[PDB]
Swiss-Prot record:
Organism of this sequence: Homo sapiens (Human)
One matching Pfam family: IDO
Tissues and organs where the protein is expressed, per its UniProt entry: Expressed in mature dendritic cells located in lymphoid organs (including lymph nodes, spleen, tonsils, Peyers's patches, the gut lamina propria, and the thymic medulla), in some epithelial cells of the female genital tract, as well as in endothelial cells of term placenta and in lung parenchyma. Weakly or not expressed in most normal tissues, but mostly inducible in most tissues. Expressed in more than 50% of tumors, either by tumoral, stromal, or endothelial cells (expression in tumor is associated with a worse clinical outcome). Not overexpressed in tumor-draining lymph nodes.
Name the UniProt record assigns to this protein: Indoleamine 2,3-dioxygenase 1
Cofactor(s) this protein requires: heme b
Miscellaneous note of the record: IDO1 is the target for therapy in a range of clinical settings, including cancer, chronic infections, autoimmune and allergic syndromes, and transplantation. IDO1 and IDO2 are 2 distinct enzymes which catalyze the same reaction. IDO2 affinity for tryptophan is much lower than that of IDO1. 50% of Caucasians harbor polymorphisms which abolish IDO2 enzymatic activity. IDO2 is expressed in human tumors in an inactive form: tryptophan degradation is entirely provided by IDO1 in these cells. IDO2 may play a role as a negative regulator of IDO1 by competing for heme-binding with IDO1. Low efficiency IDO2 enzymes have been conserved throughout vertebrate evolution, whereas higher efficiency IDO1 enzymes are dispensable in many lower vertebrate lineages.
Keywords assigned by UniProt, alphabetized: Cytoplasm, Dioxygenase, Heme, Immunity, Iron, Metal-binding, Oxidoreductase, Tryptophan catabolism
Claim: Heme is one of the keywords in the record: yes
Entry similarity comment: Belongs to the indoleamine 2,3-dioxygenase family.
EC number: 1.13.11.52
Record's keyword annotation contains Membrane: no
GO molecular function, one term: heme binding
Pathway this chain belongs to: Amino-acid degradation; L-tryptophan degradation via kynurenine pathway; L-kynurenine from L-tryptophan: step 1/2
Length: 373
């Protein structure tokens, strides 16, 4: 609905995100729109240290505040990590930290770039009247020339949107179980499965638009956060807003709601067990927008789709449920292959990880939810 901020077209993504802020914030937008020249020239940190402190009161609707969070989030990554060679700032200047933490407290999100900023809200259509294909789309902000962030954010964004074609179906599922309508529940479970088989096809495009070397050595440096990071073992200091330094995880698709939400639906208990995999994904729910957090809890509160299918001794229904579970395993087995190509191999050309065993624990938990192998 509209109380969960889910769009019929783009799902958990933000529809037609604002690209422009009020005139009153050009000093923010000037830095955010030129990070590649500013970082590379050495001017970025000084142009943020000079910056006046600006109030947030003039960010009037949601899309304004979201673009602002993206501006401020990307500026911060570039400040903290600099040129991404290892000189890290450990203090973020009050003149930018303070409005960032205040706009963050307002949207119930952490003051750091999250998946909802740099993917869900970091896109435009080139042509309003062409479709959401990679070739009529662009991102608003990047960090460096050759960081391959268009290719990465937008392919991520596109697989998000592909899987959102199945969100439409979720209420149908829950009504069908409560109204005891076996035929339309089976039909919903197979449509969902069709949607997740589709979204795998979309994923194939990563190979055309993201190069392994550029991805491993550049974009990865800027998305890193500061929770368990040796390089900021104690966190970032939000000057004038906090106390002592504060730890906050970097962006990840662990912060994506579509994939967490199909696990919950199908009764795949990714967040159970007290393991590290389950803790990370539970923790990452706090970097989701609150309406989406709240929608994952609506799901967790309905009756188990999975118990309902086991209890009915109904083979077509067990097969449709498995089509779903099998489509998630497909996505994740493919995704493991892309980690192999885009992290593991590039890292092996540097004068398994953890990672990898993380992802294969999530793959394993999915696979083990099949009713019949
Ligand atoms: C559209 C493309 C992508 C999607 C849908 C996606 C989705 C996800 C999801 C849902 C997770 C959480 C674990 C899970 O649920 O499986 C995850 C974790 C991860 N993904 Fe991806 N991802 C994408 C692109 C990439 C690329 C290109 C790479 C590597 C080059 C990558 C590397 C990772 C890594 C390293 C993790 C685990 C550690 C972390 O959170 O960063 N992903 N991804
Ligand atoms: O540790 C990894 C190193 C490689 C890239 C970034 C980080 C993980 N961060 C991510 C961020 C976004 Br935005 C989308 C994603 N999709 N999959 C991972 C992932």
């Amino acid at each position: 609905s509209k109380e969960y901020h889910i769009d019929e077209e783009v799902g958990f993504a933000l529809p037609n995100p604002q690209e422009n802020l009020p005139d009153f914030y050009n000093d923010w937008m000037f830095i955010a729109k030129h990070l590649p020249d500013l970082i590379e020239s050495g001017q970025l940190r000084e142009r943020v240290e000079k910056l006046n402190m600006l109030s947030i009161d003039h960010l009037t609707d949601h899309k304004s505040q979201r673009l602002a969070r993206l501006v401020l989030g990307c500026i911060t990554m570039a400040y903290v990590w600099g040129k991404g060679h290892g000189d890290v700032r450990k203090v973020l200047p009050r003149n930018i930290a303070v409005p960032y933490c205040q706009l963050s407290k307002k949207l119930e999100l952490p003051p750091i770039l999250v998946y909802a900023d740099c993917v869900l809200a970091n896109w435009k259509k080139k042509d309003p009247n062409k479709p959401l294909t990679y070739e009529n789309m662009d991102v608003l902000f990047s960090f460096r020339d050759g960081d391959c962030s268009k290719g990465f954010f937008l392919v991520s964004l596109l697989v998000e949107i592909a899987a959102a074609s199945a969100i439409k179906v979720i209420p149908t599922v829950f009504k069908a179980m409560q109204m005891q309508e076996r035929d339309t529940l089976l039909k919903a479970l197979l449509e969902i499965a069709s949607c997740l088989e589709k979204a795998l096809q979309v994923f194939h495009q990563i190979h055309d638009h993201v190069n392994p070397k550029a991805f491993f050595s550049v974009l990865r440096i800027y998305l890193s956060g500061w929770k368990g990071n040796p390089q900021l073992s104690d966190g970032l200091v939000y000057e004038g807003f906090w106390e002592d330094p504060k730890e906050f995880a970097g962006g990840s698709a662990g912060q994506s709601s579509v994939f967490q939400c199909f696990d919950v639906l199908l009764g795949i208990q990714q967040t159970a067990g007290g393991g590290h995999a389950a803790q990370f994904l539970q923790d990452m729910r706090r970097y989701m927008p609150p309406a989406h957090r709240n929608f994952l809890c609506s799901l967790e509160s309905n009756p188990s789709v999975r118990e309902f299918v086991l209890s009915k001794g109904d083979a077509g229904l067990r097969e449709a449920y498995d089509a779903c579970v099998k489509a998630l395993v497909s996505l994740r087995s493919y995704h493991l292959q892309i980690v192999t190509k885009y992290i593991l191999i590039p890292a092996s050309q540097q004068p398994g990880t953890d990672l990898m065993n993380f992802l294969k624990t999530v793959r394993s938990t999915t696979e083990k939810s099949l009713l019949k192998e």
